[PDB]
Amino acid sequence: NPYTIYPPVPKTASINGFADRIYDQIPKCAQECVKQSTSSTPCPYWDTGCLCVIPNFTGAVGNCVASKCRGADVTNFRKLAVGACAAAGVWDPYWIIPASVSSALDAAATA
Amino acid sequence: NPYTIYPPVPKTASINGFADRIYDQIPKCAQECVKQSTSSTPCPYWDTGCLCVIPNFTGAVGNCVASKCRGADVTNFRKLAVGACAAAGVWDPYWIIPASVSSALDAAATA
Amino acid sequence: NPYTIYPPVPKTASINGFADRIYDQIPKCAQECVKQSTSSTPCPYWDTGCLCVIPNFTGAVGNCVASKCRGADVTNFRKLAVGACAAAGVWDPYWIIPASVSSALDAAAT
Numbered sequence: 658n659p660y661t662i663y664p665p666v667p668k669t670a671s672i673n674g675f676a677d678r679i680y681d682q683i684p685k686c687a688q689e690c691v692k693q694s695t696s697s698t699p700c701p702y703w704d705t706g707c708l709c710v711i712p713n714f715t716g717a718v719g720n721c722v723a724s725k726c727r728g729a730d731v732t733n734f735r736k737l738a739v740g741a742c743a744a745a746g747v748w749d750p751y752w753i754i755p756a757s758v759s760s761a762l763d764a765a766a767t768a
Numbered sequence: 769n770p771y772t773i774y775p776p777v778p779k780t781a782s783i784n785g786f787a788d789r790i791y792d793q794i795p796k797c798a799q800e801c802v803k804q805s806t807s808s809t810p811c812p813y814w815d816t817g818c819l820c821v822i823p824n825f826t827g828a829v830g831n832c833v834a835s836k837c838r839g840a841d842v843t844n845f846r847k848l849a850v851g852a853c854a855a856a857g858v859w860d861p862y863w864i865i866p867a868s869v870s871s872a873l874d875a876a877a878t879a
Numbered sequence: 880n881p882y883t884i885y886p887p888v889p890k891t892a893s894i895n896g897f898a899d900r901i902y903d904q905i906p907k908c909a910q911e912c913v914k915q916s917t918s919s920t921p922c923p924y925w926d927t928g929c930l931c932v933i934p935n936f937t938g939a940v941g942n943c944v945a946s947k948c949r950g951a952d953v954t955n956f957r958k959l960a961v962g963a964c965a966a967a968g969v970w971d972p973y974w975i976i977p978a979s980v981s982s983a984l985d986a987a988a989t
């Protein structure tokens with residue numbers, strides 16, 4: 658199987674494979690945002706790497722953070738998302754979001 | 769531009785936008801297969817998402833893989849194709865190929 | 880058939896072929912708008928491209944967005960509609976709405 662070139666991940670989760678990695682560290686404004694349903698993805702719900710690269714999922718999370726978070730909270734959330742996805746073995750830019758969502762996050766961070 | 773709602777892609781490629789995402793991870797038997805010409809598509813040659821959904825292109829790539837790869841190489845190739853196309857923002861089933869091509873790949877995978 | 884030159888789409892949908900591409904990305908104010916009935920169209924309900932170009936459907940969707948959404952929400956909804964329709968293989972302007980509806984969306988965005 659192609660997934661053994663990546664670091665192993667727990668095959669269960671409390672929320673989901675992305676959220677579980679950062680839930681306790683993210684700014685409080687972003688906590689509701691990472692509880693996004695994984696049901697519209699092809700990802701096992703525990704699969705961090707997959708949930709880092711499916712834009713219908715990351716974009717929803719990103720849209721929510723851009724709406725709910727401002728300033729350094731946006732910046733810190735993105736650093737944590739990138740970090741978790743990078744450690745899961747995802748390629749640069751690690752947390753894979755739509756360009757429109759990135760622009761919205763940029764704006765929220767500079768508000 | 770209408771496509772900024774998708775994750776960004778490099779506007780150049782060594783081979784093409786599809787090949788470039790997976791060339792170093794795919795089995796050797798498929799390396800030449802992904803070098804399929806994009807000239808028969810409406811796709812910019814660097815456009816992964818577009819090259820994931822145009823059936824004369826995806827169909828050609830699949831027929832080639834069904835010929836050049838066997839067993840687990842086929843399954844692994846397909847997983848990589850799907851993963852790249854999904855990350856580019858394509859809808860389910862992500863790497864979109866004709867049913868006949870799907871069937872040939874099924875068979876090549878059982879060898 | 881003449882439609883096999885286009886990007887294939889799933890011949891099932893949760894809501895419809897248009898809504899399904901963008902439902903999770905659109906502003907919440909527009910969610911109800913994309914659940915518009917497809918009954919006044921000749922489109923299979925799963926057919927993204929068709930639902931991007933039949934103006935009584937696109938017009939109903941647009942009018943509802945123009946009614947329920949303001950500011951960046953309108954702009955963001957429209958980017959998603961245009962983007963999804965372009966990727967489905969529709970011709971420019973991709974999300975093809977009546978002229979009156981474009982104007983209504985224009986006003987709602989400011």
Ligand code: HEB
Pocket residue numbers: 660661663664665666699700701704705706707710745746747748850851852854855
């Ligand atoms: C589309 C779809 C998809 C995608 C995109 C993905 C993407 C991914 N992924 Fe995933 N996965 C999957 C789908 C997927 N996936 C599945 C289905 C599974 C399971 C398998 C079985 O169960 O058999 C996995 C699994 C898995 C695993 C486990 C393995 C073992 O067990 O050994 C891992 C580690 C991973 C990672 C990952 C990453 C890092 C990524 C990115 C980058 N993954």
Ligand code: HEB
Pocket residue numbers: 756769771772774775776777810811812815816817818819821856857858859886965966967968
């Ligand atoms: C038919 C045709 C077509 C199709 C089908 C498609 C499909 C697609 N696509 Fe494409 N694109 C295109 C055509 C296309 N396309 C073009 C022409 C372009 C360019 C535009 C301009 O530049 O103007 C693009 C572009 C593009 C881009 C870039 C933008 C910027 O600049 O940033 C992206 C990202 C994409 C994606 C995509 C996806 C994901 C898909 C699927 C899903 N695209």
Ligand code: HEB
Pocket residue numbers: 880881882883885886887888921922923926927928929930932967968969970
């Ligand atoms: C009115 C009418 C109409 C319109 C306008 C349309 C428009 C359209 N469309 Fe549709 N379709 C249709 C009607 C339609 N449609 C139908 C009815 C069908 C089924 C099939 C037959 O019938 O043949 C289809 C089908 C179909 C398909 C599938 C194919 C096969 O067979 O596989 C596709 C992909 C499409 C796309 C599309 C697009 C992209 C567009 C635009 C742009 N489409």
Ligand SMILES: [Cl-]
Pocket residue numbers: 847848851852
């Ligand atoms: Cl993958």
